[PDB]
Design a protein around this ligand. Structure first.
Ligand code: SF4
Ligand code: SF4
Ligand code: SF4
Lengths: 628, 628
């Protein structure tokens, strides 16, 4: 089968074959037929009595592990641990952001750039703002956010966009969230040998844990990032590997933590570093981003996006990356080995993400700007080691428009508001187009790449089908970057791909049919948007014609995201089967019984066209339930 | 191979074969040859690009996972997740204890029974005590303990017995602990795909996480349990399955959390329940404990111990267990199936541990005594369903002495203190016998059973070898219960098994050669003891001739325990190989490089006699280093 639908990706794969280096595709081929027990989730290693593998087919073979655990128990515990790991990644990101907020000052490297957003957040956290210093408010807000992570007494703080009905449903079901780290610890405790051996209770614990990601960790990370670095607005950028410059220093920012990439962007305008780049024979400094850190700097500053997850290696294969600076998460360790075949300096910066044989330059949060400057200086000085005979940059780049935060979307919707009617600054125009049926619904396309799927194929096919069916699409993460590379993040795309109702809406509001809402933590924005719509219509989020899709997901973070999206009341389609087919009870809970609990459920569909059809049918069913 | 060295265990295995019921031994046999990849730890399932298996033999076969992770990376992440799971179990136990402390009242079900212990703990937590109400002090202490779990700013609180040198070494190494749930979340975050791919850093993160178990979670759980339920003192009890009564109601308490078992013990003396037991035709109520909850109630009240981990099923096989009340952890789910073959009521009580097809009676912490009375009444009423023709109780039980908390040990040591010299109430006599060489050292024997080892064989052989070599032995958990069943927890055992120096010490102090220090969380007591000795000698804990042994461990909790014991500076022998042989770098870190870091290291030895020899040699070389 084809490795990708992206032509630049294919050219660089040919180059990697010529250079004798191996990619993620090569390692996937080397893995050959993957273990059936692990693929079905019926393998357990939770204690040293094991490893235990039970039959994925009930009634045949070994039925129980040594402790007596059934296939359903093993599957449910494995699924819960995936959710806990994803929640941990997102919560650690949000915790770093909250600590950065706590260390803001007027004359420091980290300031408050959006005071209005900070005051609204302070209102949401019961922090007084009138007649107060802005940084005192910021510190109080950071304290409340940090308490959300580890409070042992009392209730956590949740955003006002979350409907009261959803909160009450969670409380009745027993999944109402506690402090984030406490929920992670609870999931890890209940999967220990000889604890929870009941699939339904295990799934409910995992949902409870995922809620602390969706509504607390990711939400606080996003809002505090907006406070410190600015709320995203409509902004132009370029996407795909063609953004690399042969005649300039190329600095590629990979990872998830935004403070480092923000400081690197600021350092790139330093006169001394620009002069140094000129002195090493380069035209200038060309910052490019990848994955979620690329999404953040692109949403807030228009930094060009070099590529998504499965392109990271190919960025090095060009031979033009002088410095690859990585913080945490979704950083293929093979990059270190790959960097030996080129001049590239592979720089790790976080104590959480040491990588063997990489150059470690710890990013100092006490002096973020100076630390970023020294890291960037190492990248710039590496330009002298460039071998221009090994350089091949495909001439394939695509224009994209992004920056669609909830605030930006509301500002855009204000155009189609009659002044004599109003109100202004609400999601009411969006609610109106959804209720009238001009738009059939809204769908979030999120997730990673996965060698099991032709890279970016499922993302593009799902998005095109949805917008052709007058479903407005919001995108995050690597799916958003696939849309950017393909060219869907363009106003022209409305008349090229969208159906009649969505084309009319795009023309009236002057937006692309596909709205890039940011990184994987920025999925919280999607929640926020949906919540607002629900609160405007006086219904729960499970009554709306909305859906989420993860066509090509790979990460534990994706598992946690899908779990909290379903728990919030939004049906979720998974384009890659999770390792649960071995447990019939777990499959039945996730795809059938979940609808009785939270009004939504998982859909597993590896065919994107069938997924689009199912999404449209489900949205029409919910519309008929709602009367619209 | 023999299944056990215990004769009562063998008789009940014959009965289980005659009854056509499966045991843990039968399921282990059914599992046959366990997966080599999982056994070596070279299998990874951390993302849905996998499952990935790399060769346990370097230089052959597949070398890297799909993301590029090496065998060392996969092994180190798997080990770290085991540590995180064990830390989560212990920390959740301690968190429940702290919450119970927070709800103590003068006229409530949960009171303060050891005010002196509470005042000393309050001193350790910087809580004022002079001229204050005892329950105000208790609530402040509980608040400080709870803050240890989830504080995001500042430093955690550690017991005064921990040497300053050990803390400084931890700070220099980068493993100084943070809040417990924060460290669990950090480990889970760094094992996520594309985060940490460096074995040394991964092992250091796991050590940092395990410290929050050893010195914060388990320590606080133990000390708060002492405050609420009484400090253990020397007390007599009986051990092994013979403690069951044919003519009495048999109520078996299995699990770890002590509040429920304490309330059940209190409810058993209720006049209405005793009258009800008489009216259902029984002579009375016979409470028996298993595993750690049995250890707690036995340490504090002399409740008879029915058996350790791999005996739990056999307790039901007797046909005499009218009620089996379980809370969390090390509860084989197969019990639910097994109790169908008998009249036994298998009662789950904790929302953390639901077991399918068991009778769920949620233990209400708000009204603990009434809830315990209701559960106990269900067990008593089940006596009418006893089938006395199916009853077979082995006439095999053994006298044991336990209750050796640090306070009790100090009280015993006061006997050999010359009044004209002093001081009293210190560990000085123990330090003196260790320094003079009358005792060669002290060894902690802890851990579970494991079907991979003849049950209780390794525990007994290791303990007998150590005490024969004039090494005083402290025991916890299932190892302590194996010693109890065998008969080592007896004063007579001193003259039957101990060497000359240990026999003299036992005669002078009037103690058994093997000291039962309580449950698995009570391993913190061992730490406390060692710390005191170190603080009395002005040395670090790694300079002492001390060691820890886990001859037959199975649980993730055991992994976390061994990790924090080694990190504290105490060499640890493992009688069951952990899944790390596939990563040569991880093996080298755990067994060789750890000594450079923390002055102690792991020893993997499956032969108990060889383990005893190695322990004696290591203790002698540490003595020669210390000059004693
Ligand atoms: S999933 Fe289990 S059975 Fe399959 S290779 Fe991995 S450890 Fe072995
Ligand atoms: S927890 Fe149970 S099923 Fe899992 S490895 Fe241990 S004995 Fe086997
Ligand atoms: S994290 Fe890497 S090694 Fe582990 S399953 Fe995913 S791709 Fe394979």
């Amino acid at each position: 089968k084809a490795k990708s639908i992206d032509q630049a990706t294919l050219q660089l794969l040919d180059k990697a074959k010529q250079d004798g280096v191996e990619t993620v595709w090569d390692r996937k081929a080397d893995m050959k037929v993957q273990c059936g027990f692990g693929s079905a989730g019926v393998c357990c290693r939770n204690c040293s009595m094991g490893p235990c593998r039970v039959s994925p087919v009930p009634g045949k073979g070994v039925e129980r592990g040594i402790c007596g655990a059934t296939a359903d128990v093993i599957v449910s515990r494995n699924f819960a641990r995936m959710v806990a790991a994803g929640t941990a990644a997102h919560s650690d990101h949000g915790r770093s952001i909250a600590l950065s907020l706590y260390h803001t000052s007027k004359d420091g490297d980290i300031k408050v750039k959006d005071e209005n957003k900070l005051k609204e957040v302070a209102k949401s956290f019961n922090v007084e703002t009138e007649g107060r210093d802005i940084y005192d408010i910021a510190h109080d807000v950071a304290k409340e956010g940090l308490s959300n992570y580890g409070k042992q007494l009392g209730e956590v703080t949740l955003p006002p966009s979350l409907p009261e009905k959803r909160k009450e449903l969670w409380r009745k079901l027993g999944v109402y969230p506690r402090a984030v780290d406490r929920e992670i610890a609870a999931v890890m405790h209940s999967t220990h040998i000889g604890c929870n051996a009941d699939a339904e209770a295990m799934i409910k614990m995992s949902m409870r844990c995922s809620l602390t990601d969706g509504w607390m960790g990711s939400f606080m990370g996003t809002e505090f990032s907006d406070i410190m670095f600015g709320t995203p607005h409509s902004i132009d950028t370029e996407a795909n590997l063609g953004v690399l410059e042969k005649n300039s220093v190329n600095v590629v920012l990979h990872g998830h933590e935004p403070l480092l990439s923000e400081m690197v962007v600021e350092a790139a305008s330093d006169p001394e570093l620009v002069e140094l780049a000129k002195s090493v024979g380069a035209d200038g400094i060309n910052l490019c981003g990848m994955c979620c850190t690329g999404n953040e700097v692109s949403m807030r500053h228009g930094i060009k996006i070099a590529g998504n997850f499965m392109q990271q290696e190919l960025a090095v294969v060009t031979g033009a990356v002088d410095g690859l600076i990585v913080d945490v998460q979704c950083i293929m360790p093979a990059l270190a080995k790959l960097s030996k075949s080129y001049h590239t300096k592979f720089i790790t910066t976080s104590p959480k993400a040491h990588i063997t044989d990489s150059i470690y330059m710890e990013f100092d949060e006490e002096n973020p700007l100076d630390s970023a400057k020294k890291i960037l200086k190492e990248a710039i000085l590496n330009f002298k080691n460039r071998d221009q005979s090994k350089v091949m940059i495909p001439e394939l780049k695509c224009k994209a428009i992004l920056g669609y935060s909830v605030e930006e979307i509301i500002n855009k919707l204000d155009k189609v508001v009659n002044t004599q009617i109003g109100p202004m600054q609400t999601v009411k125009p969006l609610a109106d187009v959804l209720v009238s049926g001009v738009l059939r619904g809204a769908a979030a396309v999120v997730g990673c790449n996965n060698p099991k799927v032709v890279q970016d194929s499922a993302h593009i096919e799902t998005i095109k089908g949805l917008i052709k069916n007058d479903v407005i699409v919001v995108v995050t993460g690597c799916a958003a970057q696939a849309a950017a590379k393909y060219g869907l993040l363009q106003k022209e795309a409305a008349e090229k791909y969208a159906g009649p109702g969505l084309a009319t809406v795009c023309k009236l509001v002057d937006i692309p049919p596909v709205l890039h809402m940011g990184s994987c933590v920025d999925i919280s924005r999607i929640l926020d948007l949906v919540g607002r719509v629900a609160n405007l219509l006086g219904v729960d989020m499970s009554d709306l014609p909305v859906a989420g899709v993860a066509p090509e997901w790979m990460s534990e973070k994706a598992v946690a995201i899908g779990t909290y999206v379903v728990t919030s009341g939004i049906d979720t389609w998974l384009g890659v089967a999770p390792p649960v087919t071995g447990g019939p009870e777990v499959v039945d809970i996730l795809t059938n019984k979940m609808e009785d609990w939270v009004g939504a459920k998982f859909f597993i569909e590896t065919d994107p066209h069938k997924a689009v059809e199912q999404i449209v049918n489900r949205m029409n069913e919910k519309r008929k339930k709602l009367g619209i």
